[PDB]
Amino acid sequence: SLSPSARRVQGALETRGFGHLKVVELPASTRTAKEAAQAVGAEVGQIVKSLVFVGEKGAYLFLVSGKNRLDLGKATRLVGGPLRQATPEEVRELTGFAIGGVPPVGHNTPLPAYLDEDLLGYPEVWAAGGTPRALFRATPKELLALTGAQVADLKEG
């Protein structure tokens, strides 16, 4: 059913012990946080954007709520060294997925991660499932368990 990249994310959820979480590849786009929320009837804040930044020693994953903008200054202080937004080419090289479908798991390398503390305000959130049509629902606590992320104030607001 699922396209390869979506199947890759579903396989990662299964491998990590969260096989009860299901990737869906929908009849409406989920490319942007706005479209993803409309596709599943969620508030945009419940959508998880998985953003990749490149640092001096490696890359980092920032899981940001769809209602927030990642503050590069805050991210830089958290990592403790310079950071720059990954180009679409670097996103593909690093994660195995392309912009619009970057998931929080299943990458070529598990990236140290940070979770936007506002995601903890929702009982369930939806993260990308590997493609611009794929999402999976999970509780914020399950997302933390899946990524090992550290909770942080990431937003510009």
Ligand X SMILES: Nc1ncnc2c1ncn2[C@@H]1O[C@H](COS(=O)(=O)NC(=O)[C@@H](N)CS)[C@@H](O)[C@H]1O
The closest residue (CB) to ligand X is 49
**Pick 38 or 120: Cβ nearer ligand X:** 38
**Pick 18 or 38: Cβ nearer ligand X:** 38
Q: What part of residues 105-144 is at the interface with ligand X (CB under 6 A)?
A: 128, 132
Residue 49 in the binding site for ligand X (CB under 6 A): yes
The answer to whether 115 and 139 have CB atoms below 8 angstroms apart is no
Q: What part of residues 78-97 is at the interface with ligand X (CB under 6 A)?
A: 85, 87-88
Stretch of residues binding ligand X (CB under 6 A), selected from 15-23, 30-38, 111-119, 147-155: 30-38
What distance in Å separates the CA atoms of residue 60 and residue 39, rounded to the nearest whole number?
Answer: 28
What distance in Å separates the CA atoms of residue 64 and residue 144, rounded to the nearest whole number?
Answer: 12
Stretch of residues binding ligand X (CB under 6 A), selected from 12-20, 29-37, 73-81, 112-120: 29-37
Phi, psi of 98 (to 5 degrees): -110, 155
The only residue of 9, 23, 25, 30 in contact with ligand X, by rule CB under 6 A: 30
What distance in Å separates the CA atoms of residue 39 and residue 33, rounded to the nearest whole number?
Answer: 10
Give the DSSP letter of residue 26. -
Phi, psi of 63 (to 5 degrees): -100, 110
**Pick 21 or 102: Cβ nearer ligand X:** 102
> Per the structure block, which two tokens stand in for 126?
């939806």
- For the bound state, the minimum distance from the C-beta of residue 49 to ligand X, rounded and expressed in Å, comes to 3
